[PDB]
Amino acid sequence: DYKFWYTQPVPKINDEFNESVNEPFISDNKVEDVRKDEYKLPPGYSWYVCDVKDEKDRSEIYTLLTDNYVEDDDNIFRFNYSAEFLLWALTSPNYLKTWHIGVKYDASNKLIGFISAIPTDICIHKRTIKMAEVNFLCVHKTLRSKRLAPVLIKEITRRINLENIWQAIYTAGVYLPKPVSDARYYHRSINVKKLIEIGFSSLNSRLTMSRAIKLYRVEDTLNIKNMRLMKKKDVEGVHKLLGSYLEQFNLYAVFTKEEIAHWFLPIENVIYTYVNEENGKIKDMISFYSLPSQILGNDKYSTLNAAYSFYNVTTTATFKQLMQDAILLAKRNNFDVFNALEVMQNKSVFEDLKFGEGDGSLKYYLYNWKCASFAPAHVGIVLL
Ligand SMILES: C#CCCCCCCCCCCCC(=O)SCCNC(=O)CCNC(=O)[C@H](O)C(C)(C)COP(=O)(O)OP(=O)(O)OC[C@H]1O[C@@H](n2cnc3c(N)ncnc32)[C@H](O)[C@@H]1OP(=O)(O)O
Ligand SMILES: [Cl-]
Ligand SMILES: [Cl-]
Ligand SMILES: [Mg+2]
């Protein structure tokens, strides 16, 4: 029935727009007319502005998400974004502290809800629009189905609109009105025995343990020999190589040089970017971020260490060769599995590089924007 969503400027479930339509649902917005009062919470609850740069505030967000954030459809894994990852994800160029919004239960002073956004220029069907990218919506497990999520969404919408920003981008596994694109995850096992043991992968009479280990074995030699960790000197180069690649897609972030430094410069256990420099030019790049899952009630392993593909571009090798190198670099950094969405060129390598299809998919959404939807190979943005 979507009783909340059908109040909002998003498409109905059966809306179909053709390529001649690429504009807002609601235009001519004025900051002057945005509500200046905070949305009302149920009695006993209060808004709290989180300071993500403060270690203690950040640890409170970390705890809320560790305990209550997204699980796989089978409730076997729960994402466990690290505190240093959250610091990176939320303090991008020009971020607003006041879009990092928490809800405390007053009687215990405990954070029980959170939602966040950061600002970025998004190009959709060649039109570039300032958007908020919304993420980390989370309601404590003990307070589910009480309609707190619409309150957090309406309050962040209000605060984003105060900055004269009227569109947003967000992804989710749940189906909501209405995806602009839909992309499955695929996974490439690295630490095969651990993935078996925790119930992530399986074996059969044809695929014995030893045969599975051999199937997923990787040669410890790079196809692109000079791939090395990115440094500050490489920011102009990555800005040109990635910037030029992305222009072909129907949906992508238009990164400034400051944004390139922020999103790609390596941070241990958070973001890994490797470059190939030839003649003072950056000609290939690989990048992947760290997102572990807590393995729910497992005796042996508490954590699945997963690398998620971010942005990969080659001009000196094949895409296959580049992605075989990304799996190698993730292996050299202790990751158990390399995951990727069927966006950009990724699906073209999945068969040959022995990826498995994951369950369900990730839906891409715009708020207050009507346009044609498209196949996920035309998506050129990866959100965290
Ligand atoms: C400018 C501008 C606009 C700015 C705003 C743009 C819109 C942004 C939307 C939010 C985007 C979120 C992106 C993500 O971060 S992804 C990960 C979501 N994090 C989890 O998966 C963690 C585990 N899970 C939870 O923590 C809770 O289940 C949630 C997700 C907070 C939902 O809370 P609960 O207690 O279930 O549900 P209640 O409070 O009764 O709310 C029901 C209404 O809510 C809608 N809803 C549910 N999940 C949603 C969701 N994931 N995103 C958006 N809406 C969602 C839903 O359909 C329904 O509304 P209807 O009646 O159907 O029209
Ligand atoms: Cl009022
Ligand atoms: Cl090597
Ligand atoms: Mg609720």
Ordered structural domains, the chain, with CATH: 1-384 (3.40.630.170)
**109: Cβ–Cβ under 8 A, 6 or more apart, which residues?**
none
148: helix, strand or coil? helix
* Contact call for residues 306 and 77 (beta carbons, < 8 A): no
Calculate helix-pair angle for 55-68, 83-90, nearest 10 degrees.
110
Nearest bound ligand to the CA of residue 218: 3
Interatomic CA distance for residues 161 and 326, integer angstroms: 39
Give the chain's radius of gyration (CA, Å).
21
- Cα-to-chain-centroid distance, residue 130: 18
The dihedral region occupied by 237, where left means phi > 0, alpha psi between -120 and 50, and beta the remainder, is alpha
How many angstroms does the Cα of residue 150 sit away from the middle of ligand 4?
8
Interatomic CA distance for residues 197 and 371, integer angstroms: 45
Residue 129, CA distances (Å) to 123, 291, 313, 325 in order: 6, 29, 24, 34
Query: Do β-strands 370-371 and 251-253 pair in parallel, antiparallel, or remain unpaired?
Result: unpaired
How many angstroms does the Cα of residue 155 sit away from the middle of ligand 1?
13
* DSSP assignment of 152-192: HHHHHHHHHHHTT--EEEEEESS--S--SEEE-EEEEESSH
Question: Which helix or strand (DSSP H or E) is residue 351 part of?
Answer: none
- Side chain identity, residue 330: A
Interatomic CA distance for residues 165 and 132, integer angstroms: 7
* Contact call for residues 337 and 77 (beta carbons, < 8 A): no
Residue 16, CA distances (Å) to 1, 25, 51, 256 in order: 18, 14, 41, 33
For ligand 1, which residues put their CB under 6 angstroms from it? Answer: 2-5, 68-70, 132, 134-139, 144-150, 153, 156-157, 160-161, 165-168, 170, 172, 174, 176, 367
Residues with CB under 5 A from ligand 4 (ion): 139, 146, 148
Resolution to 1 decimal place, in Å: 1.8
DSSP letter (8 states) at residue 36? -
Structure tokens at 323: 């992605």
Other beta carbons within 10 angstroms of residue 41's beta carbon come to: 17
The residue nearest atom 3 of ligand 1, judged by CA position, is 157
Interatomic CA distance for residues 72 and 69, integer angstroms: 10
Interatomic CA distance for residues 27 and 191, integer angstroms: 51
Supply φ then ψ for residue 127, to 5 degrees: -100, 130
**Tally of CA atoms within 13 A in the half-sphere of 136 that contains its CB:** 29
